[PDB]
Design an enzyme around this catalytic site. Structure first.
Site, PDB file in Angstrom:
ATOM      1  N   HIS A   1      -9.647  10.783  -1.376  1.00  0.00           N
ATOM      2  CA  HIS A   1     -10.890  10.399  -0.773  1.00  0.00           C
ATOM      3  C   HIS A   1     -10.608   9.576   0.475  1.00  0.00           C
ATOM      4  CE1 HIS A   1     -15.224   9.604  -0.655  1.00  0.00           C
ATOM      5  NE2 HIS A   1     -14.814   8.515   0.004  1.00  0.00           N
ATOM      6  N   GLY A   2     -11.026  10.105   1.631  1.00  0.00           N
ATOM      7  CA  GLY A   2     -10.842   9.448   2.904  1.00  0.00           C
ATOM      8  C   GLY A   2     -12.132   8.803   3.361  1.00  0.00           C
ATOM      9  N   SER A   3     -12.019   7.683   4.072  1.00  0.00           N
ATOM     10  CA  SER A   3     -13.179   7.015   4.677  1.00  0.00           C
ATOM     11  C   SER A   3     -12.710   6.152   5.856  1.00  0.00           C
ATOM     12  CB  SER A   3     -13.903   6.198   3.643  1.00  0.00           C
ATOM     13  OG  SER A   3     -15.133   5.717   4.145  1.00  0.00           O
TER      14      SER A   3
ATOM     15  N   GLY B   1     -15.950  -2.720   1.315  1.00  0.00           N
ATOM     16  CA  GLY B   1     -17.018  -2.299   0.394  1.00  0.00           C
ATOM     17  C   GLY B   1     -16.484  -1.451  -0.736  1.00  0.00           C
TER      18      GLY B   1
ATOM     19  N   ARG C   1     -19.068   4.785  -4.248  1.00  0.00           N
ATOM     20  CA  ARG C   1     -20.447   4.914  -4.677  1.00  0.00           C
ATOM     21  C   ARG C   1     -21.014   6.221  -4.124  1.00  0.00           C
ATOM     22  NH1 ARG C   1     -20.698  -0.344  -2.098  1.00  0.00           N
ATOM     23  NH2 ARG C   1     -22.928  -0.118  -1.618  1.00  0.00           N
TER      24      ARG C   1
ATOM     25  N   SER D   1      -9.418  15.266   3.326  1.00  0.00           N
ATOM     26  CA  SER D   1      -9.883  13.908   3.140  1.00  0.00           C
ATOM     27  C   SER D   1      -9.507  13.018   4.327  1.00  0.00           C
ATOM     28  CB  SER D   1      -9.368  13.341   1.856  1.00  0.00           C
ATOM     29  OG  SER D   1     -10.198  13.740   0.783  1.00  0.00           O
TER      30      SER D   1
ATOM     31  N   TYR E   1     -11.753  12.461   7.234  1.00  0.00           N
ATOM     32  CA  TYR E   1     -12.891  11.533   7.125  1.00  0.00           C
ATOM     33  C   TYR E   1     -12.490  10.079   7.433  1.00  0.00           C
ATOM     34  CZ  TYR E   1     -15.704  15.396   5.410  1.00  0.00           C
ATOM     35  OH  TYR E   1     -16.364  16.588   5.279  1.00  0.00           O
TER      36      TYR E   1
ATOM     37  N   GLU F   1     -13.325  21.354  -2.973  1.00  0.00           N
ATOM     38  CA  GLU F   1     -13.753  19.975  -3.042  1.00  0.00           C
ATOM     39  C   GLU F   1     -14.314  19.741  -4.433  1.00  0.00           C
ATOM     40  OE1 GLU F   1     -16.085  20.444   0.507  1.00  0.00           O
ATOM     41  OE2 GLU F   1     -17.943  20.032  -0.534  1.00  0.00           O
TER      42      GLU F   1
HETATM   43  N1  LIG Z   1     -14.441  11.766   2.010  1.00  0.00           N
HETATM   44  C1  LIG Z   1     -13.636  12.718   1.529  1.00  0.00           C
HETATM   45  O1  LIG Z   1     -12.444  12.509   1.250  1.00  0.00           O
HETATM   46  C2  LIG Z   1     -14.212  14.080   1.325  1.00  0.00           C
HETATM   47  C3  LIG Z   1     -13.437  14.988   0.602  1.00  0.00           C
HETATM   48  C4  LIG Z   1     -13.911  16.255   0.324  1.00  0.00           C
HETATM   49  C5  LIG Z   1     -15.157  16.655   0.776  1.00  0.00           C
HETATM   50  C6  LIG Z   1     -15.939  15.767   1.509  1.00  0.00           C
HETATM   51  C7  LIG Z   1     -15.474  14.485   1.774  1.00  0.00           C
HETATM   52  O2  LIG Z   1     -16.437  13.741   2.429  1.00  0.00           O
HETATM   53  C8  LIG Z   1     -17.562  14.523   2.603  1.00  0.00           C
HETATM   54  C9  LIG Z   1     -18.651  14.145   3.276  1.00  0.00           C
HETATM   55  C10 LIG Z   1     -18.925  12.979   4.106  1.00  0.00           C
HETATM   56  C11 LIG Z   1     -18.075  11.893   4.344  1.00  0.00           C
HETATM   57  C12 LIG Z   1     -18.439  10.876   5.210  1.00  0.00           C
HETATM   58  C13 LIG Z   1     -19.661  10.914   5.878  1.00  0.00           C
HETATM   59  C14 LIG Z   1     -20.058   9.892   6.894  1.00  0.00           C
HETATM   60  O3  LIG Z   1     -19.439   9.829   7.938  1.00  0.00           O
HETATM   61  N2  LIG Z   1     -21.174   9.163   6.683  1.00  0.00           N
HETATM   62  C15 LIG Z   1     -21.835   8.372   7.732  1.00  0.00           C
HETATM   63  C16 LIG Z   1     -21.721   6.874   7.444  1.00  0.00           C
HETATM   64  N3  LIG Z   1     -21.274   6.656   6.051  1.00  0.00           N
HETATM   65  C17 LIG Z   1     -21.286   7.618   5.070  1.00  0.00           C
HETATM   66  N4  LIG Z   1     -20.799   7.150   3.947  1.00  0.00           N
HETATM   67  N5  LIG Z   1     -20.449   5.820   4.178  1.00  0.00           N
HETATM   68  C18 LIG Z   1     -20.746   5.548   5.430  1.00  0.00           C
HETATM   69  C19 LIG Z   1     -20.571   4.223   6.108  1.00  0.00           C
HETATM   70  C20 LIG Z   1     -21.739   3.594   6.821  1.00  0.00           C
HETATM   71  C21 LIG Z   1     -21.231   2.980   5.575  1.00  0.00           C
HETATM   72  C22 LIG Z   1     -21.788   9.003   5.366  1.00  0.00           C
HETATM   73  C23 LIG Z   1     -20.519  11.982   5.631  1.00  0.00           C
HETATM   74  C24 LIG Z   1     -20.163  12.985   4.750  1.00  0.00           C
HETATM   75  C25 LIG Z   1     -17.319  15.848   2.033  1.00  0.00           C
HETATM   76  O4  LIG Z   1     -18.098  16.801   2.032  1.00  0.00           O
HETATM   77 CL   LIG Z   2     -14.630  16.564   8.922  1.00  0.00          CL
END
Ligand SMILES: NC(=O)c1cccc2c1O/C(=C\c1ccc(C(=O)N3CCn4c(nnc4C4CC4)C3)cc1)C2=O
Ligand SMILES: [Cl-]
Length: 241
Positions: A93-95, A102, A109, A135, A138, A219
């Site tokens: 899971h990437g962010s 958080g 969440r 991931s 992201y 996914e």
């Molecule tokens: N995150 C993963 O590793 C991942 C892996 C496989 C599929 C998906 C994944 O992420 C997905 C979607 C996704 C991931 C990120 C975002 C994204 O950029 N968003 C905007 C802002 N945001 C979001 N969630 N948290 C925040 C931050 C403000 C507090 C939604 C939107 C969609 C997939 O469909």
């Molecule tokens: Cl992407």
């Protein structure tokens, strides 16, 4: 004045942009330990990274800088209903870096009821990949900012609802615990490994033989936060094309 190991201090600094390192550490409510570079865990993890980088994601290479083992307060107890569930898998899971305070303090969440759905093929849940790059995308890392963070969570998938096309799942079918989006490419299922009784799909990607699927890569989605037990946090270097 910090009493933390240096790699953890640098993690903390990265995660929090005024306050001392050690006090910000406490805010995470997360036990964080450096995994030794030359350990078995670290080898398996570096392999997962190595082998599950998609050929479509060739704008960068990934290098693992530090591997952290992490224990969120309360999560052991929270996960307990699912700890014996079948089909538990170690998934990415990437962010963005700015989300990680958080994420560690409150766990992964589900997007709130009212957030927009674009970006999510199967409704609001917690999304994971078996391909590190899917991931890692992201992390929204760049040339200018080439360091990112990615999680490995133990995810209790149980009986998977396996779908090829986008569908906003409001309620899982009876007996299902998760959704899997079927990719055209999949880590080689015969190359799965077990780490602490959790399946790691770290085989190189092969054709899934799933026809007429809209996804390139798998996914996995859970709709209950309790189905996720975070295990590792990697600090990754992105080297750009
Ligand atoms: N995150 C993963 O590793 C991942 C892996 C496989 C599929 C998906 C994944 O992420 C997905 C979607 C996704 C991931 C990120 C975002 C994204 O950029 N968003 C905007 C802002 N945001 C979001 N969630 N948290 C925040 C931050 C403000 C507090 C939604 C939107 C969609 C997939 O469909
Ligand atoms: Cl992407």
């Amino acid at each position: 004045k910090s009493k933390l190991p240096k790699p953890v201090q640098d993690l903390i600094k990265m995660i929090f942009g005024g306050d001392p390192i050690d006090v910000n550490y406490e805010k995470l409510k997360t036990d964080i330990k450096v995994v030794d570079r030359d350990s078995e865990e670290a080898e398996i993890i570096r392999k997962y990274v190595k082998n599950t980088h998609a050929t479509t994601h060739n704008a960068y290479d990934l290098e693992v800088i530090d591997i952290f083992k992490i224990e969120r307060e309360g999560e052991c107890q929270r996960y307990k209903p699912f700890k014996q569930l079948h089909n538990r898998r170690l998934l990415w899971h990437g962010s963005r870096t700015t989300n990680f305070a958080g994420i560690l303090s409150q766990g992964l969440r589900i997007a709130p009821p009212e957030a927009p759905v674009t970006g999510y093929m199967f409704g609001k849940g917690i999304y994971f990949a078996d391909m590190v790059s899917k991931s890692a995308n992201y992390c929204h890392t760049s040339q200018g900012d080439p360091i990112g963070l990615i999680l490995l969570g133990e995810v209790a998938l149980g009986n998977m609802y396996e779908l090829k096309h986008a569908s906003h799942i409001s309620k899982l079918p009876k007996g299902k615990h998760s959704v899997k989006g079927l990719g055209k490419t999949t880590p080689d299922p015969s190359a799965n490994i077990s780490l602490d009784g959790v399946d790691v799909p770290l085989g190189t990607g092969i054709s899934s033989g799933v026809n007429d699927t809209s996804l390139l890569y798998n996914e996995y989605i859970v709709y209950d936060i309790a189905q996720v037990n975070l295990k590792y946090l990697l600090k990754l270097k992105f080297n750009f094309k």
